[PDB]
Amino acid sequence: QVQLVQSGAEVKKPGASVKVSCQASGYRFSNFVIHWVRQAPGQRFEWMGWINPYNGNKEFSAKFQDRVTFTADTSANTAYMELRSLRSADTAVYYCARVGPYSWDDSPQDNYYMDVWGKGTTVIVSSASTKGPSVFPLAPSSKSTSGGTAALGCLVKDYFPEPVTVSWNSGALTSGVHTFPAVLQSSGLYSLSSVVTVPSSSLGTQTYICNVNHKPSNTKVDKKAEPKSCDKTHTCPPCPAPELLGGPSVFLFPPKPKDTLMISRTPEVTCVVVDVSHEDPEVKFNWYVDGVEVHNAKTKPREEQYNSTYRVVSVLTVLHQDWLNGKEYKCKVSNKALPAPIEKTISKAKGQPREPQVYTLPPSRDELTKNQVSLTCLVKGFYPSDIAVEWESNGQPENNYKTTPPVLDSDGSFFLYSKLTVDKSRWQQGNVFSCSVMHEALHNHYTQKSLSLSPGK
Amino acid sequence: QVQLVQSGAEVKKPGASVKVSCQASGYRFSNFVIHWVRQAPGQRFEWMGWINPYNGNKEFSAKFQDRVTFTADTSANTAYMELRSLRSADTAVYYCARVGPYSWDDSPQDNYYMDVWGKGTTVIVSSASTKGPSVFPLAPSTAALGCLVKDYFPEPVTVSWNSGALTSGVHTFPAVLQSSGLYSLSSVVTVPSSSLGTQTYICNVNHKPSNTKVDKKAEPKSCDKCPPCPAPELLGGPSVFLFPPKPKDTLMISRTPEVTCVVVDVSHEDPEVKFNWYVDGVEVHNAKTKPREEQYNSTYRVVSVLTVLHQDWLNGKEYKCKVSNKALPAPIEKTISKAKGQPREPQVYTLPPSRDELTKNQVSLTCLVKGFYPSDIAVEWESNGQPENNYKTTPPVLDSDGSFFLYSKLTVDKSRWQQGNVFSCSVMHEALHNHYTQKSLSLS
Amino acid sequence: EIVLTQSPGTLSLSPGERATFSCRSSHSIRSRRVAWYQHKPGQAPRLVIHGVSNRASGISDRFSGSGSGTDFTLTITRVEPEDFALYYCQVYGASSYTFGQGTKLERKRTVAAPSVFIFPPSDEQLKSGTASVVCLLNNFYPREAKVQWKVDNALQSGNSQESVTEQDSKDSTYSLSSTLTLSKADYEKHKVYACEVTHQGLRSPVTKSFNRGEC
Amino acid sequence: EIVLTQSPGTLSLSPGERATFSCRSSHSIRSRRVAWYQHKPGQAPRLVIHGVSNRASGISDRFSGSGSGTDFTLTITRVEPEDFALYYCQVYGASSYTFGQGTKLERKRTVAAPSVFIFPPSDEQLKSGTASVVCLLNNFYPREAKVQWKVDNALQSGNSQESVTEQDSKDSTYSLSSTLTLSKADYEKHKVYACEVTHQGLRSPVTKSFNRGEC
């Protein structure tokens, strides 16, 4: 278990002096000699000398005799190496090794070869005071994929003394990584570069941040190597929203006719708001029924508009009795960007009711040559215009139909037409179609008229 | 022509003195007294006194009876005003005014009002001295960019843009007197933000009194050197509405189709409106405007009517109406044309009265018209070669396949129906063969 | 002695409208020696009426003068585009020459909101030892406005000067320019600068601003 | 003095192959005091052979050194995976301690062309005054590769520095990263910035480039 342990790395300046230790064990310390060999960057190993623990006898290399001091301490089992007047060139790893076993058949010094070494101790000798690493991105540009991938990395330039550790994505990214060995600059600062190849596609999708470390200056840095944006302050200025209105504006809407007449549905009065600047998006509504306020309202979330405006809406599901009686509703809205509180009122269209006459009309003979025919429903004589027209057959609702809007007639009442389109076959198969009309001036607010091919078939 | 011309502007220092001249013309100089009136900035006109060229007589204002001297040279048709011991308060425009004619039935001095005035000579009194202006531009951040002419003396200062090239939008503001005894004026000019980087803007400030002349570039700041679809403004003033021709007019040779441009909310303040029409870009001058109409809500309605050629319209030519009003920042433009899209020929179907309706005194004859495009169409009812009266047609309505349909309802006494009379539903649409088709309807 | 008071201070009318100018006197003018003058900025004053009611040569029959004792009136039956200008009454003759303060007949148009802008002091000026921040209000109407500077959220005062142009011949609108004067010393002491504008065509007082610095 | 010249510079073979290291000295070594050492990055050199031909304790009989006079050898019967390292020779004793320059036993693998990527100076870095132009050569083999820079087709030199990685543990390839360094002044006085790469796997010099500020 013959082992040799040396001191730790050290960093001196041009003129200082270093003293490295060398402690052994596993063998008789004063029964062997200790050599001292260094190896500077790019240089061959250099033997400096040797000292003998048993009698302190030491031989020096012509190149270090005048500057080295081999001093042993048998009590501690440690050999010391001391170099002084250290200049730059003296930078290197200084090892200490023990001679080999003095065999029987060998002559004096035949065993003086480096038998067991130590891990050496690095010694940097320069006039560069500690500094912090620089983190610059080696980002990929939009080059040609052709038949390959992309590469990006980090540059750790101008620091002292080394080392430095680099990782990508807090130890998540390892494969493909290549941290290059430091390079001492004419400035006396080490340079470094860590790179990684990754699929070209992932560029815009994956996040790559290299973690840089440099303990000597207790510095840490994490930079996101992001692909250089191909945009040079691409022209198109900040703060793109308008402002030439007496604040936002309000518009109110009444419930749908059928809803007010038929029970299956509940009345809904909508209050919409637009032109709600982004500087003041907060909106508040208030509801007054004939003056008497109520909070049973519900406000749907806000949405964004094309030209930088919002669409806030408050739907106050009102009641049949209220609406039909002529109850007056009011939606008051106030916004900070608005000078005055905008409030609007809504209520059922009043007027002397007139009972609608419903008439179904079969297809014209000429249209019978087509594959689809028109079943017509005429509704006339009604007032007010609020009405609902629906079509059904065999207990089910037809789909394909369109009703004209109410049209003012010669006498002040309204009339309209609803057109149901159905395949000629259904008409000829004798199916019975019926037009349902829902209006306030109808008994039970409901009436029906049927239509079907003359008896025949 | 009575001419009262006075001498150039003066610039004196406190305690100094000034003497203004006034040369009369077009009348017998010595037949009218000459008044001297001044007006200091922000002050009322001050009468200083008058002199009678005839006899050399003079009258003074108690306020100026000590330091003013009225002299006149009969031979030189000129009067002079000499004010000494000038203070700061003596800075004002000094006027020279002549009395009116005197007639036998005037009482002495009834004509001593100021009949004819001079343009006035401006006299500035201060301690400061001639200084050059400091041109410090007002770079952009429509956007407006301008210059700043600071600390100068004495007035005036001439600022120009691009050597008189840029006029519209330029606002050279009146100067202000800084407590330092120097003036500071600022001229601006709102310019289309679209030329912030394509145009070169420089003001040409000149200060003849000091012989200064500095030109300075007014270019944007270095913060950046892509138009989606910006939205128009609305200063709340006139509003234009361009209407298409009556469909019937576009299909009959005996009718004359016209596109109508209506301008509403035309202020009583500025009712004059200018109309500019364009057919596919080319301007036309056949339009005709109608007399303005007073609206119940205190505004005006102005209508311009441009007749069009049947074929021009049916072939899809665009009609542009350009409205201009003093209250309008920029004139409003509106364009219209017949709808685009495959023409589709209409189907015409007549439907007799529902059996149930036959119990009433009046029945409904129905004309279903469907499958057509554009929606422009004209529907009529006739009988025995004569046009019926009592019918209403619903507006066109969009059907499931993209074309339109409509119904027309003719009302007649159950009598006429029962008697077997024949009625016809006439339809005029561009997509019909020969643009016209009919469908009869009768009992039995 | 005599003091003449004109009212109203300003008349805002439209071509075709009726203009009535009032001139009140502290004394009764039995001499009936009252005159009315028209004055267009930059031009020589014109005599419109003399002897309280006699029109001056070349004056439109549209102008008429009346009054007696202590009250005198100038009236224009139907205003014409070139009738807009200052109008002054006056008593003259026999050491009694005094003028009224003036009534401004300005052209009335529909309210027009001003386009408020705010400029930063040119760098070249800062290094000099002074700093000027100008807030421009463009093409508005009526004449009166209210520009209140806000120095880094503060009701500034007494160091800014206004200046208004004459109603535009075309659009009939005014444009104001308030200049904020402060040394670079005080200039480089606060972060942001504001300029509030209270016009009539603005229910919500607008305040355009810029953050002191670079861009 | 004694000079030891090792051969070959680099010895690349696949596991299982026979390895022979040469070490020639300027002088004969009759003392037979020749030793061989193995060295691995970061670890402590290890004695393999001593006295010309004597395995050190713990050395597989795979190793064996012979030679005499002026030429000495070291051979591995069959190369194992853990053998790939640096091998030095030296003469020791009697104040004659000198080492060889070392022979590198690397991993033999198929020829591989380098993937060359180039990166322009970072926007930030340009703030200081220095420009760092990097040029990568990814996972190539063998090691010998030439890198030339051309700023405006101007063959640069003496302003760049290289660096290389230890033979890849997995695919036995190397990667080099040259660095062009100029002043922000030079970088902004040229346009074309290329990095020419010549390799045993590239039929022709590969040139990856870019131009002064151009995405």
PDB file of C-alpha atoms in Angstrom, chain D residues 93-209:
ATOM      1  CA  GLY D  93      20.737   7.499 -12.550  1.00  0.00           C
ATOM      2  CA  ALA D  94      24.071   9.201 -12.009  1.00  0.00           C
ATOM      3  CA  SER D  95      22.740  12.719 -12.522  1.00  0.00           C
ATOM      4  CA  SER D  96      21.424  11.832 -15.990  1.00  0.00           C
ATOM      5  CA  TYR D  97      17.669  12.205 -15.620  1.00  0.00           C
ATOM      6  CA  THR D  98      15.997  12.957 -18.945  1.00  0.00           C
ATOM      7  CA  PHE D  99      12.605  12.001 -20.467  1.00  0.00           C
ATOM      8  CA  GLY D 100      11.284  11.391 -23.966  1.00  0.00           C
ATOM      9  CA  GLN D 101       8.616  13.652 -25.474  1.00  0.00           C
ATOM     10  CA  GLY D 102       6.097  10.834 -25.144  1.00  0.00           C
ATOM     11  CA  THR D 103       4.055   8.664 -27.472  1.00  0.00           C
ATOM     12  CA  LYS D 104       0.260   8.744 -27.452  1.00  0.00           C
ATOM     13  CA  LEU D 105      -1.534   5.399 -27.690  1.00  0.00           C
ATOM     14  CA  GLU D 106      -4.986   6.455 -28.945  1.00  0.00           C
ATOM     15  CA  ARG D 107      -8.151   4.635 -29.972  1.00  0.00           C
ATOM     16  CA  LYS D 108      -8.250   3.610 -33.627  1.00  0.00           C
ATOM     17  CA  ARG D 109     -11.529   4.220 -35.427  1.00  0.00           C
ATOM     18  CA  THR D 110     -12.911   4.962 -38.914  1.00  0.00           C
ATOM     19  CA  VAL D 111     -12.175   8.275 -40.622  1.00  0.00           C
ATOM     20  CA  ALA D 112     -14.657  11.000 -39.714  1.00  0.00           C
ATOM     21  CA  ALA D 113     -15.237  14.406 -41.295  1.00  0.00           C
ATOM     22  CA  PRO D 114     -15.578  17.402 -38.950  1.00  0.00           C
ATOM     23  CA  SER D 115     -18.867  19.253 -38.610  1.00  0.00           C
ATOM     24  CA  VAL D 116     -17.823  22.902 -38.800  1.00  0.00           C
ATOM     25  CA  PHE D 117     -19.965  25.580 -37.170  1.00  0.00           C
ATOM     26  CA  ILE D 118     -19.017  29.259 -36.927  1.00  0.00           C
ATOM     27  CA  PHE D 119     -20.220  31.918 -34.492  1.00  0.00           C
ATOM     28  CA  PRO D 120     -19.906  35.707 -34.879  1.00  0.00           C
ATOM     29  CA  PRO D 121     -19.098  38.125 -32.007  1.00  0.00           C
ATOM     30  CA  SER D 122     -21.858  38.546 -29.424  1.00  0.00           C
ATOM     31  CA  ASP D 123     -23.723  41.847 -29.401  1.00  0.00           C
ATOM     32  CA  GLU D 124     -22.847  42.288 -25.724  1.00  0.00           C
ATOM     33  CA  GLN D 125     -19.130  41.537 -25.997  1.00  0.00           C
ATOM     34  CA  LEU D 126     -18.749  44.307 -28.560  1.00  0.00           C
ATOM     35  CA  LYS D 127     -19.449  46.684 -25.670  1.00  0.00           C
ATOM     36  CA  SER D 128     -15.935  46.187 -24.255  1.00  0.00           C
ATOM     37  CA  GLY D 129     -13.863  46.603 -27.409  1.00  0.00           C
ATOM     38  CA  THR D 130     -12.771  43.050 -28.166  1.00  0.00           C
ATOM     39  CA  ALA D 131     -14.383  40.687 -30.657  1.00  0.00           C
ATOM     40  CA  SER D 132     -14.463  36.917 -30.123  1.00  0.00           C
ATOM     41  CA  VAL D 133     -15.045  34.972 -33.330  1.00  0.00           C
ATOM     42  CA  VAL D 134     -15.321  31.246 -32.621  1.00  0.00           C
ATOM     43  CA  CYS D 135     -15.132  28.313 -35.045  1.00  0.00           C
ATOM     44  CA  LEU D 136     -16.062  24.783 -34.017  1.00  0.00           C
ATOM     45  CA  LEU D 137     -15.000  21.425 -35.495  1.00  0.00           C
ATOM     46  CA  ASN D 138     -17.249  18.683 -34.115  1.00  0.00           C
ATOM     47  CA  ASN D 139     -16.321  15.036 -33.458  1.00  0.00           C
ATOM     48  CA  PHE D 140     -13.671  14.431 -36.160  1.00  0.00           C
ATOM     49  CA  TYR D 141     -10.879  11.866 -36.614  1.00  0.00           C
ATOM     50  CA  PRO D 142      -7.941  11.557 -36.958  1.00  0.00           C
ATOM     51  CA  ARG D 143      -6.690  14.504 -34.853  1.00  0.00           C
ATOM     52  CA  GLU D 144      -4.662  16.340 -37.500  1.00  0.00           C
ATOM     53  CA  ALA D 145      -6.781  19.196 -38.871  1.00  0.00           C
ATOM     54  CA  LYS D 146      -5.985  22.644 -40.323  1.00  0.00           C
ATOM     55  CA  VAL D 147      -7.842  25.838 -39.445  1.00  0.00           C
ATOM     56  CA  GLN D 148      -7.400  29.101 -41.360  1.00  0.00           C
ATOM     57  CA  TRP D 149      -9.250  32.399 -41.038  1.00  0.00           C
ATOM     58  CA  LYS D 150     -10.028  34.845 -43.834  1.00  0.00           C
ATOM     59  CA  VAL D 151     -11.268  38.332 -43.000  1.00  0.00           C
ATOM     60  CA  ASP D 152     -12.156  39.794 -46.399  1.00  0.00           C
ATOM     61  CA  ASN D 153     -10.200  36.942 -47.975  1.00  0.00           C
ATOM     62  CA  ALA D 154      -7.174  38.071 -45.947  1.00  0.00           C
ATOM     63  CA  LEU D 155      -5.450  34.984 -44.545  1.00  0.00           C
ATOM     64  CA  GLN D 156      -5.120  35.971 -40.872  1.00  0.00           C
ATOM     65  CA  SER D 157      -2.501  34.599 -38.476  1.00  0.00           C
ATOM     66  CA  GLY D 158      -0.993  34.991 -35.022  1.00  0.00           C
ATOM     67  CA  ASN D 159      -4.275  36.327 -33.647  1.00  0.00           C
ATOM     68  CA  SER D 160      -6.076  33.040 -33.108  1.00  0.00           C
ATOM     69  CA  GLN D 161      -5.838  30.318 -30.467  1.00  0.00           C
ATOM     70  CA  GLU D 162      -6.931  26.668 -30.539  1.00  0.00           C
ATOM     71  CA  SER D 163      -8.044  24.076 -28.000  1.00  0.00           C
ATOM     72  CA  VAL D 164      -8.945  20.380 -28.242  1.00  0.00           C
ATOM     73  CA  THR D 165     -10.794  17.688 -26.325  1.00  0.00           C
ATOM     74  CA  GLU D 166      -9.489  14.301 -25.219  1.00  0.00           C
ATOM     75  CA  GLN D 167     -10.476  11.476 -27.576  1.00  0.00           C
ATOM     76  CA  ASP D 168     -14.194  10.955 -27.010  1.00  0.00           C
ATOM     77  CA  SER D 169     -14.935   8.191 -24.541  1.00  0.00           C
ATOM     78  CA  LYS D 170     -17.798   6.918 -26.704  1.00  0.00           C
ATOM     79  CA  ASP D 171     -17.172   7.498 -30.428  1.00  0.00           C
ATOM     80  CA  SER D 172     -13.388   8.024 -30.277  1.00  0.00           C
ATOM     81  CA  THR D 173     -13.504  11.418 -31.987  1.00  0.00           C
ATOM     82  CA  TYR D 174     -12.014  14.826 -31.279  1.00  0.00           C
ATOM     83  CA  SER D 175     -13.329  18.376 -31.412  1.00  0.00           C
ATOM     84  CA  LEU D 176     -11.302  21.547 -31.917  1.00  0.00           C
ATOM     85  CA  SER D 177     -12.326  25.152 -31.342  1.00  0.00           C
ATOM     86  CA  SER D 178     -10.204  27.908 -32.876  1.00  0.00           C
ATOM     87  CA  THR D 179     -10.720  31.509 -31.786  1.00  0.00           C
ATOM     88  CA  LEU D 180     -10.204  34.677 -33.823  1.00  0.00           C
ATOM     89  CA  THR D 181      -9.753  37.760 -31.648  1.00  0.00           C
ATOM     90  CA  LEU D 182      -9.623  41.350 -32.864  1.00  0.00           C
ATOM     91  CA  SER D 183     -10.558  44.821 -31.661  1.00  0.00           C
ATOM     92  CA  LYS D 184     -14.114  46.053 -32.214  1.00  0.00           C
ATOM     93  CA  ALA D 185     -12.351  48.437 -34.582  1.00  0.00           C
ATOM     94  CA  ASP D 186     -11.045  45.733 -36.941  1.00  0.00           C
ATOM     95  CA  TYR D 187     -14.261  43.715 -36.815  1.00  0.00           C
ATOM     96  CA  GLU D 188     -16.198  46.750 -38.042  1.00  0.00           C
ATOM     97  CA  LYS D 189     -13.778  47.493 -40.880  1.00  0.00           C
ATOM     98  CA  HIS D 190     -14.334  44.212 -42.702  1.00  0.00           C
ATOM     99  CA  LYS D 191     -17.312  42.144 -43.907  1.00  0.00           C
ATOM    100  CA  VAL D 192     -16.432  38.578 -44.903  1.00  0.00           C
ATOM    101  CA  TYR D 193     -15.555  36.377 -41.924  1.00  0.00           C
ATOM    102  CA  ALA D 194     -14.739  32.778 -42.785  1.00  0.00           C
ATOM    103  CA  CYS D 195     -13.145  29.740 -41.142  1.00  0.00           C
ATOM    104  CA  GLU D 196     -11.419  27.310 -43.509  1.00  0.00           C
ATOM    105  CA  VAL D 197     -11.261  23.687 -42.342  1.00  0.00           C
ATOM    106  CA  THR D 198      -9.037  21.084 -44.014  1.00  0.00           C
ATOM    107  CA  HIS D 199      -9.227  17.433 -42.967  1.00  0.00           C
ATOM    108  CA  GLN D 200      -8.385  13.871 -44.020  1.00  0.00           C
ATOM    109  CA  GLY D 201     -12.123  13.302 -44.272  1.00  0.00           C
ATOM    110  CA  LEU D 202     -12.913  16.440 -46.256  1.00  0.00           C
ATOM    111  CA  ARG D 203     -12.220  16.161 -49.992  1.00  0.00           C
ATOM    112  CA  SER D 204     -11.876  19.946 -50.088  1.00  0.00           C
ATOM    113  CA  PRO D 205     -11.392  22.729 -47.498  1.00  0.00           C
ATOM    114  CA  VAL D 206     -14.759  23.486 -45.881  1.00  0.00           C
ATOM    115  CA  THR D 207     -15.560  27.165 -45.378  1.00  0.00           C
ATOM    116  CA  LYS D 208     -18.248  28.344 -42.975  1.00  0.00           C
ATOM    117  CA  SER D 209     -18.708  32.110 -42.930  1.00  0.00           C
TER     118      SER D 209
END
